Amino acid sequence: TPAITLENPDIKYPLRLIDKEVVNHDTRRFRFALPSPEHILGLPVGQHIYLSARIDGNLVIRPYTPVSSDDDKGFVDLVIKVYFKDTHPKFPAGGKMSQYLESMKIGDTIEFRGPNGLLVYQGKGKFAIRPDKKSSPVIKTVKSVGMIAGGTGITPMLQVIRAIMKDPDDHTVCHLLFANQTEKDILLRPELEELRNEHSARFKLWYTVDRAPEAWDYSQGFVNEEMIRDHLPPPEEEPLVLMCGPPPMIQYACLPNLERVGHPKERCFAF
Ligand SMILES: Cc1cc2nc3c(=O)[nH]c(=O)nc-3n(C[C@H](O)[C@H](O)[C@H](O)COP(=O)(O)OP(=O)(O)OC[C@H]3O[C@@H](n4cnc5c(N)ncnc54)[C@H](O)[C@@H]3O)c2cc1C
């Protein structure tokens, strides 16, 4: 089996930026070389890495979920939204790590660490979820999984979706509700729709956008009760519901509406 990059979560591994690609107006794909062309990252499905750097004199550490997998040898791909300065009146300085990444030249390095996270997908509907960092995982096996993602929150979902569809004996059905500001902000749409086309029995896909185009067949607005009722499995199926998005999306749009529909807190997990 392949050499593993992340052997110890307490250790930092400097990886070299080798390629970069524009995804949309504010988002890019960054490809980093692993320690050798035959290495894999070593990242259990459901977990993430952290990038860290000293940026303008302060320590900055942020979590990312690669869009690559442990089937990929020799590289790791991150899809990252850049929060530019001088753009948002509420955040004139923009974002620290994302702008740092955007400023990197091919050949520059940045430290990776991992794997981390309370949730690990063990395949065939089986999730190992620690209540917190000091407790044993609770092993929950479900027939279906609800997923609510906003913006870059798609990456933890996509990692799980891909892991499932890869295994023809994994009968778990994923229902994704993916929220973004506008149509052009729907990250990884071609990948998601390719998955839908190939795995429609196991992958249900729905979008909402804050602001919708004229020709729009999906939903519009923040996540609401109707969207959760119509686009996630019903509470009676006892699915796990995973969420990843901006804090107010989780707090105000997801949780109260999950409760209205009848999904218990015990079934819900926020990345
Ligand atoms: C499990 C997990 C996986 C993640 N995976 C990814 C991923 O694959 N790709 C990815 O890009 N991110 C991912 N994130 C988010 C990531 O960790 C950071 O939060 C993000 O990159 C921003 O960090 P920052 O240092 O650049 O910005 P920060 O300095 O921390 O400040 C940014 C925050 O302030 C606000 N802000 C600042 N500038 C602007 C602006 N111009 N417009 C709008 N809002 C602004 C935003 O709320 C933003 O979140 C993931 C998070 C988690 C928890």
Swiss-Prot record:
It comes from the Eukaryota. The modification Phosphotyrosine is found at Y13. InterPro entries: CBR-like (IPR001834), Cbr1-like_FAD-bd_dom (IPR008333), FAD-bd_FR_type (IPR017927), Flavoprot_Pyr_Nucl_cyt_Rdtase (IPR001709), FNR_nucleotide-bd (IPR039261), OxRdtase_FAD/NAD-bd (IPR001433), Riboflavin_synthase-like_b-brl (IPR017938). Keywords: Acetylation, Cholesterol biosynthesis, Cholesterol metabolism, Endoplasmic reticulum, FAD, Flavoprotein, Lipid biosynthesis, Lipid metabolism, Lipoprotein, Membrane, Mitochondrion, Mitochondrion outer membrane, NAD, Oxidoreductase, Phosphoprotein, Steroid biosynthesis, Steroid metabolism, Sterol biosynthesis, Sterol metabolism. Changing H48Y: Similar properties to wild-type. Transmembrane segments: none annotated. PROSITE patterns: FAD_FR. Residues 10-122 form the FAD-binding FR-type domain. Changing T65V: 10% of wild-type kcat values. This is NADH-cytochrome b5 reductase 3.
